[PDB]
Structure formats: C-alpha cells, structure tokens
Protein: Fusion glycoprotein F0
Organism: Nipah henipavirus
Amino acid sequence: ILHYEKLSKIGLVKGVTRKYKIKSNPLTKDIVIKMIPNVSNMSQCTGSVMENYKTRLNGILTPIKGALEIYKNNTHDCVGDVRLAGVCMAGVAIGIATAAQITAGVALYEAMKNADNINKLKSSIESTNEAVVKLQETAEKTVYVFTALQDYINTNLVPTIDKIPCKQTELSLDLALSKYLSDLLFVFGPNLQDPVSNSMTIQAISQAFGGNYETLLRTLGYATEDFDDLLESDSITGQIIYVDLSSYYIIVRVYFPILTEIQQAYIQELLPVSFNNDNSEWISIVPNFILVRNTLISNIEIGFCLITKRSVICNQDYATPMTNNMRECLTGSTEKCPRELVVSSHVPRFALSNGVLFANCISVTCQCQTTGRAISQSGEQTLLMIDNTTCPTAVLGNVIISLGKYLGSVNYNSEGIAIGPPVFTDKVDISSQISSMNQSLQ
Amino acid sequence: ILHYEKLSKIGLVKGVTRKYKIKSNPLTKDIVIKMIPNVSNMSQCTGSVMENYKTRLNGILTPIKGALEIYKNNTHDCVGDVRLAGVCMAGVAIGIATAAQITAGVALYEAMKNADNINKLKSSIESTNEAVVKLQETAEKTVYVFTALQDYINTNLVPTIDKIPCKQTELSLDLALSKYLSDLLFVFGPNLQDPVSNSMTIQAISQAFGGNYETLLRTLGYATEDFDDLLESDSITGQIIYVDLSSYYIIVRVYFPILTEIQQAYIQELLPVSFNNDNSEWISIVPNFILVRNTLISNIEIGFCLITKRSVICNQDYATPMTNNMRECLTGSTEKCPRELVVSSHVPRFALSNGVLFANCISVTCQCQTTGRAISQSGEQTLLMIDNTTCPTAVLGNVIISLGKYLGSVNYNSEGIAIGPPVFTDKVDISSQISSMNQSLQ
Amino acid sequence: NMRECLTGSTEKCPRELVVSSHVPRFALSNGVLFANCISVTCQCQTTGR
Amino acid sequence: NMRECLTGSTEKCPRELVVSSHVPRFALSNGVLFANCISVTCQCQTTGR
C-alpha cells in the first residue's frame, strides 16, 4: 500500500519490515518480597537503627495498605449460579475508579484466594534469612521469598562483625538501610499513588530487591525463548496483593505473558535521505515507523515499544491515528509530504535498499570505479539511483560499494516528481507559525 | 407469602421449610480410565479373546472419538488480541450444535492443553496394571489411572492360573469381558450420542470402572463437607476429553463444584390431610413442594432434586412456572384450590405441625385423654385443630400425643372457609374432561 | 393445531415462561447462530463492538 | 477555547479517533458508572438482561 518509488524520490528510502506483536494471555506466579532483612545473627549490638528503620518503613508502607484496603473492604464473592459467580464490588464505597483500576481490583480479589494461603506462612516468611528462599505452599504448589537486604548483611556485616568496632557496623548498617530507602522512594514512595494497578514493571518492582530483576525471573523460570523481549518492552508486570506492617513483607503476583504476533500487521521503517531542490538540501518530515494492519495505515508511538531486528514488540497496543494527508502522502500523493531545510552538516545523504543505492550526488561526490569517472547529478533531479545497470561498482567518499539491480522502473533516474512545502519543526516554531496564520486570517 | 392458616383447613398442613442451593464454581480434576485390562501376567494362555475384545471395544469407542473429532478438527486458539481471550470455533464445519454442546466444546479445548501433557504419558498409561494408579504429568501435577478389570484379574484369575485348566480361565475371562461390555453399553454404547457434554454424572462414568465411583471420588478427594449432597443430586459430573483407539483408554475431566445457597429463597413442603365436605372425604391437589425466591412463588420440578432435612439441592436451577390460580390458591384464595375425592382407605387423615395436630375427627376415632370424653367434629367443620386449649393430651386410634400452644387465631375451630371444585387426576381422566368440555362448548 | 403450528402457523405454538436460569439461550444450525442477545451479551470480534 | 470547553461548551472540546485496542472504556465516579456499552459487553445482574 506504500508506494516506495515516490517515497524514495522524495528521500524516504525503503527500510526493514518488522512484524507487530503485543503482550497477551498472561500466566501468573506469586512471590513475596520481605523489605526488611533478618539481622538475627548480627543483632548483638545492632543498636536502635532497627527500630528507626521499622518506623520509616511503616510510614512508607502504610499508604500502600491504605489504598489496598479500599478494594479489600469492598470486594466480596457474589452468591448463586445465576452469574459467573465471581466478585461483587461495593462501588459506592470505592467512589473513584478507572477501568484499569477496577480490573486490577478483580485480579487482586482473584489473587486473594492464594494470598490467604501464603499469609498462613507468616511465621515461615519472617524466618527467612537468605536473599532467595523457596517454600512449599502445598503438596502440589510453591512460593518464593526474596529478602531486600540479606546478601549484603550475610556477605559483609556478618563476616566483619568483629574485625571492626561494633559502632562502625552500626553506621554501615544505617547507611545501607538508608541507601535502600533512597533507591526505594522512586517506586514505593509517595510516587506510588495507585498500588492496586498491575501496570508496574518487574524492573520497578525489583527496586525493592536491590534492582536485581534477573534473579526474580531466573528463579521463577525462563518460560519461553522470547524472554529478553517481554523483559525489555515492559511486558512483564507485577501487582502488590497484600501488604503486612508487622513483618514488613509484600506479596507480588508476577505476570508472564506470551507474545502474539498480530496477523496482517507489519511495521515499516523509512530511512530519510537529504535531497537537492532549488539549490539547497532538504529532508522530508515523515514518521520513521508506520504501522500498516488490515490494509489500514496508522502511526505508532514506538518510543515505548521495542524495535528488534525482525519484530516490533509492545506491552500494549500503541497504535495511534495518522492524518489523512499523511496517508495520501504515503500512498503516492507526494506533494502533501512536508520537508525541512537542513542546515546541519551531519545529516545522512545516501542510503542502500535492496542493494540499489540512492544518493544526493550534488551534496556528496560520486564517481564510478569501473569507468574511472565522476557520477553527475543534475540540478533538477532530487536523488540519483545507482545500480548495476548504471555501473556495478560506485564509490561515495571513502567507501567502495557494489550494487545490485533495481526492481522498479528502468527509467527511474529520468522521471521527476512534485515537491511539497517547507516546514519548521522547532517547539517555538509551532507557536511562531500559529501566530502568523492567525494574523493572516485576521 | 403463604397463608398456612387458610391452607390448613383445606388440608394443607404446614411442613418443613428447606433452603435452596445449586451447584456453582466447579473445580476441574483430570483422570484417565483404561477400558481394557492389562493381561500381561496371564498372557500365557489368554487365547484369542483379547483380539475379539479389542475389535468389539473399538466398535464402541470409534463413534465417541468420531463425535469428539468434530470438535478437535474444528477447535484452535485465536490471536487473542483481535478480541478478549477465548477459543475459536470452526462453526461452518460444526453445523449443528446447542449452547451446551458449544460450552462443552470450549471446556474440551481448554482441557486439551492438559490432555496433551497426559498423552505425553501414553506408554506409562498403557503399562498400568493396578485398578488405581497415581502418575505425574509434572512435579507440581499428579494424574490418576483407573484400569478396567485389572483388580478382578489380579485377585481371582491370576491366582487360579494353574489350579484349573486354563482353557476354563480363557472362558471365564471371555465371560468377564462380555459382562463388562454389557454393563458398559447402557452408558458408553449407542446411547452416548453426545460425548461433547458435561451433563453426564460420575455415577454413569464409573460404569467404565465397574460402577465404583466411590474409589474415583475418595482417591481424588473429599474437598467439601457437603460431599454426599453433591453426589446424590447428580451434581458431580465429568466429560470425556480424549479417546485413544490403540491403548483403549479415555481421559475424563471430573468436576467438583460447591453448593451455593440461593439467597432469599426457601422450599416449603405442604402435607395433605383428608377433610370432610358433604359427607365424604377429599384430598386437595396442590404441589407438595413450593419454591419461593425473592418473594416470587413458583413450582419446582423436585423429582431430580435431592431433599434433605434442611435444604433442597439440585444440579440445575430446576424452578418451573406456576399457574396464577395456584398462586392465588397458595396465598389465601382457597376457592381456587383443587380437591380430589378419596376412594382409597389408605390416605393420611391427621398431621402434626408446630406441636398442634389437624385431624379428621369423624373418619378416625377421635377422643381426648385428660377428660376421657370423645372429641366431636360437626359436619360443617372440615378439620379440627386439637391443641392443649381443648385438652393437653389427645388420643387418635392407638397413639396418645401431647400437644402445645397454637400461634394463630384462637377461635380457629369456629371459623369455616369456602371450598373449591372437585378434580380427577388420572391420565385418562384428563382426556375425558377435555372431550366433555369441548363437546359442551360446541 | 400442532400440525398447523409446525407448518408455519406459529401463533398456535404454545409457549412457557422461563423460571430456570439454566435454559439454553443460543444454538448453531448450518453455521448460522440463533441467539437471544437480550439475555446473553453478543459482541462479534471483527467489528469489535 | 480550552477554558470554554471545560466550563460547558463541549462543542469546543477536541477529540481524537481511537486506534489502540487498549483504551479505557468504563470509569466509576461517585458510585455511578459511565461506560461505552456498545464497545464493551454490558448487562444487568438483578434481571440478567
């Protein structure tokens, strides 16, 4: 549906084509993170820092449980075989809620059925003294405990409990806990206005475990070969389902989705190339990545998506609309495409697609090795296509390139196109332009 | 509500009030039933009956697999992103299907994911030679195998493999297999036209295991305290999800639900008592059991439901509509209540409710104890309430009973009511009455 | 009257009010789906609505 | 214009077409629900309809 020839003549050379996949069908695994370490082996002269850290952690964790109780008090199992018989919502007692928040609330109740069983293990969870521990939940089920600060204690403070003054061990400890809290406040501090939702990434959750999410995910298991993907695209998300203020440990349900490639849906990348026109260099302003699905053309906000070599991966359908004029431009109405005059000397001037070379030989010196003579671009040709018909080996500065054959029109370099109007894309330029048109209208 | 006082004079003495509960939220457990014994230890002179049993068995299991494959060849996971999660159905290739059939299909595909794991164990399943065997499909998931006649062969055939001429052993094994097949044909034979359904009771499924469902359910687990209830009301059901024509074994997903009390609903049982009118005995024709739900009164087809001392239990919402005239007859308008003349001499004539007894004092000897004088009923009073007001101990035939207070009107026995029209409830009487009224209309 | 009911005169086919919450509500014939969308929510995926 | 849009003149409130299958469709305010029941499954519990 994209017409590549006029795009190339404007300066949008073909790029890689990647499939579009989204997170889907999430499996669940439950774990607990003890945000307080066991200092039992080194409690002889820990001092009063333990109590002060206790109060600070209580102060931080209290709003989380307060927000959770809004759903906990208002979640109940509706009675009788008439409906799916799931959970009822005291909506008038909830007051303000979104679709995502309510959905998380339902998943929170669902997980309560297992969280009650894990909370039966409270004494075992308190007794944990290793940075990772596995516990039997049932004869057919298991749960993992992660200690926020057990590795540091067990590796440094316990071995060095006598070789230095104990007061110094007090400071070190205090400093370690304060460092934990400082790293924590970005995620578990007052920034966490909505702990109920499950949109929080496992990377953010691991901040409660010192930022080591690779241990969370390895201990739970590399369920699929796409693992690095669901990891980078922020597709692996977790939810806090129970907060305890006595043992200072939270239960997190980790979600491991599967990446569903969307059928009839591919992502196209366009390479911009500076082109000559009216004795100056210009670069067209079009989206680098375009999403074409069901013969429908729409943009994509790929900043939050992951662009691998073969697929574009998103934790959410990040498709966004595209202007009608942009659709006509990418369809072939090339005069509707905007262009920006380039004043930077560090803009790329040539690109290679399918082995055929598009270049601006006015801006960059081109000569062919086979014939030992310059390759000339005239003043009315925006870009020069070089392929094996032109000559099988051309150069561009310090690179020797060998080119394949073109698949489109044989007389490509002899046919011109129309060119659009200039644009300026600075933040203040938009305000400046809007004033000008408004004044012109008046 | 029900007007017990006006109903009592018609003969509808109040009875036990029972709660109403229905199966909901079924849990799923998976098992395999090997419809063929392992004859490995007796194979020395098993004869040729094994092959003929194989062919006869195949003749029964082939239609079941054929009906399942209408779904298996027409069931797959969709993208799951085009629309909220579900299972795709090739409906053009299915053709004819009910809602229940499609629901079973969905459950069938859903279970297929576990069924693939169980089938990965096919060699282990074939190797079973105990009547009950426990196996792993993974370290956190058990599965059970129940062989066909393994225990019987293990207990009487193998021990007697030499003490008698083993040609007689061949004959006895042939008879045993034929007995199994004859028992099976009631359920798994041509009557099983819809293996894609979860309405088949565990009692019927156990016929493949010799009718021994108690072993199925004990080995799987008595998870609830209402277990006998779920068992008798035909609430515990199972579905066949895999049929194998080479190892001759099926996989069944057994459902263990929980009984939900239908809130603001109860079942009232009415006792009939013969009463006088115009020098003859009559018994009213009304439903013995009435279902009142959310202040709405309706019949219940209670034949399939199970009646306990405290509640009425059904594997389905078996509520049925009720006539407007029955409504008015049950809420006070006794003139619309039906009545049937009693010709039989074995109709109950007195009943006891709340410690007071409503009796037919002329059709049965009716005297009091504390005075020695008889209790007389006039020809205008349909029934006589006898309570401790008239005397605290009454005699009826050979039973002497002590009676308590009455809670309703004090002057009950002095107030009469209107009486309805007679009816006849024979199957042929309905046709005769229809014909007579049709001829009367003409 | 039943014969006329099954041969197109649907006004003579008797009907019963529904009291069971477990009565069938959709059915599939010839790959064509007949359902009572008032009692069961219907939203096909291709229109997404 | 944005001010007017927020204080009643909804004809001045700009709108963008939806292309994300993951856009919010319902929201709870003051115990009362505002939802787009043509784009999402929508039924009542007390009547089943």
